[PDB]
Write a protein that binds this ligand. Structure first.
Ligand SMILES: CN(C)CCOC(=O)c1c(Cc2ccccc2)c(-c2cc(Cl)nc(N)n2)nn1C
Length: 454
């Protein structure tokens, strides 16, 4: 069986949630289901990024970093896939995976996912990982325009895996409160986590008669897309997709144009692994605690329509979209493949301010915050051959992310963006520098005030 079609190469960049969805063209589009989520924090392994920028790597730092990082992440991805998971998205610091099932099967799948999580830690018993698990209701949001599409999962099961991850330490498996409540406590030995109703898994000791492989095989019964039969030894059913112009047209909207060029063998397959000077514009849109996914969807859609319009003008791109802690964040990048300018900084700031001004007027968005940072970041396709994504990794990515969270409601920028801007100083305001999560000394940070006092 030949399987190297463009449609298959595109499907590699997407989860089954998208590849085998059959939903409408209306945007936003929303859907609701239940499942188990797994969040694998892979920092410590992506904190090395600074080492590989050193002159010791003789201008092959990016290539060496992508190689060693994919060595490890692809092993994590194989475990997830073999246990029936769907990897939803990659980021420099983590990956999120989903086991979507009927509510009545959540109990058994949690055991599958816990076994998976511990086999993942088993891969690193000679850097390590941190794993959070959650279970419950999940809402999916698809937004975009006629040429591009983005998706998110939303809900407290998503927020649950957020906090479960934040509590974890190296080699931990933390289960959200609702996951612990729905899990098979007959099999899962836990321990308290102080002043937190979430729990840490110590052992998975099953009944004497329990045979996991038979148990897993029965669980695959409810996994709609687990490879089986003649395809039992494929990691993804996506690998079997055949040409379908209508499906490919839909799928390619989720994929960055430069990726598609490479997919089409119109660009060298290594062109996108690089250490590149870029400007990160990290946009956060916050909604109120009580806001529900059917009201958030339209707000994100309206914000997105304007965001993409401004980025096209100032020649930026959306690398990633996330949502947790009731905030939807856009990881935007300027100076990405091909399109780099020496006025990129003023454009990034002006684009930020434009996005700040519009989005603050979108209703149901309570707060807009944008962090801007410029510097060298690693760019590359990260993951497994059969499931990977273009991602950016580096100090300035994390800095932009921290700035938008620690300085809400304004546009902030780093000392690099400030000095290099083709703009005068009174356009800015030096900020009180706060102590931020896992951040080296910033340098001075600034608020982009804009051209007016008003
Ligand atoms: C700031 N970033 C550098 C780190 C952010 O955390 C991620 O790395 C990250 C996230 C966000 C997230 C969501 C819930 C719990 C923890 C983290 C997602 C993600 C994917 C999808 Cl489909 N839907 C939503 N809502 N989120 N995927 N990844 C890889």
């Amino acid at each position: 069986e030949f399987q190297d079609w463009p449609i298959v190469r595109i499907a590699a960049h997407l989860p089954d949630l998208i590849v085998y969805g059959h939903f409408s063209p209306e945007r936003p589009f929303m859907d609701y289901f239940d499942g188990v989520l797994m969040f694998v924090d892979i920092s410590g392994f992506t904190a090395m990024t600074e080492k590989f920028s050193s002159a010791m790597y003789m201008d092959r730092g990016a290539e060496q970093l992508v190689e060693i990082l994919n060595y490890h992440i692809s092993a994590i991805v194989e475990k997830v896939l073999i246990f029936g998971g769907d990897i939803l998205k990659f980021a420099g610091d983590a990956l999120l995976a989903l086991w979507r099932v009927e509510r009545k099967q959540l109990k058994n799948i949690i055991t599958v996912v816990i076994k998976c999580s511990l086999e993942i830690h088993g891969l690193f018993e000679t850097i390590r990982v941190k794993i959070g698990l959650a279970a419950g209701h999940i809402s999916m949001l698809v937004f975009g325009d006629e040429t591009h599409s983005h998706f998110l999962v939303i809900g407290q099961a998503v927020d649950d895996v957020r906090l479960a991850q934040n509590m974890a330490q190296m080699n931990d498996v933390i289960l959200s409160p609702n996951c612990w409540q729905l899990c098979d406590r007959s099999m899962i030995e836990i321990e308290s986590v102080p002043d937190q109703r979430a729990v840490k898994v110590n052992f998975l000791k099953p009944p004497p008669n329990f045979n996991f492989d038979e148990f897993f095989t029965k669980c695959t019964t409810f996994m709609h897309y687990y490879p089986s039969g003649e395809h039992k030894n494929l990691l993804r059913l996506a690998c079997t997709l055949k040409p379908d112009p209508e499906l490919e047209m839909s799928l390619q909207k989720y994929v960055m144009e430069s990726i598609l060029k490479q997919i089409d063998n119109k660009q060298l397959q290594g062109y996108l692994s690089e250490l590149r000077p870029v400007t990160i514009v990290f946009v956060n849109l916050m909604f109120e605690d009580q806001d529900k996914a059917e009201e958030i969807g339209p707000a994100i859609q309206d914000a997105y329509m304007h965001i993409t319009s401004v980025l096209k003008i100032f020649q930026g791109q959306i690398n990633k979209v996330f949502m947790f802690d009731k905030g939807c964040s856009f990881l935007c990048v300027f100076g990405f493949p091909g399109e780099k300018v020496p006025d990129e900084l003023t454009h990034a700031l002006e684009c930020a301010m434009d996005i700040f001004d519009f989005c603050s007027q979108v209703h149901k968005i309570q707060t807009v915050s944008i962090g801007v940072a410029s510097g060298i970041v690693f760019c590359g396709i990260v993951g497994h051959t059969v499931r990977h994504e273009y991602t950016v990794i580096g100090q300035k990515v994390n800095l932009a992310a921290r700035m938008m969270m620690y300085y809400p409601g304004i546009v902030t920028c780093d000392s690099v963006t400030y000095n290099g801007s083709n703009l005068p100083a009174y356009f800015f305001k030096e900020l009180p520098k706060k102590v931020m999560k896992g951040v080296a000394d910033s340098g001075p940070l600034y608020q982009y005030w804009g051209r007016t006092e008003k």
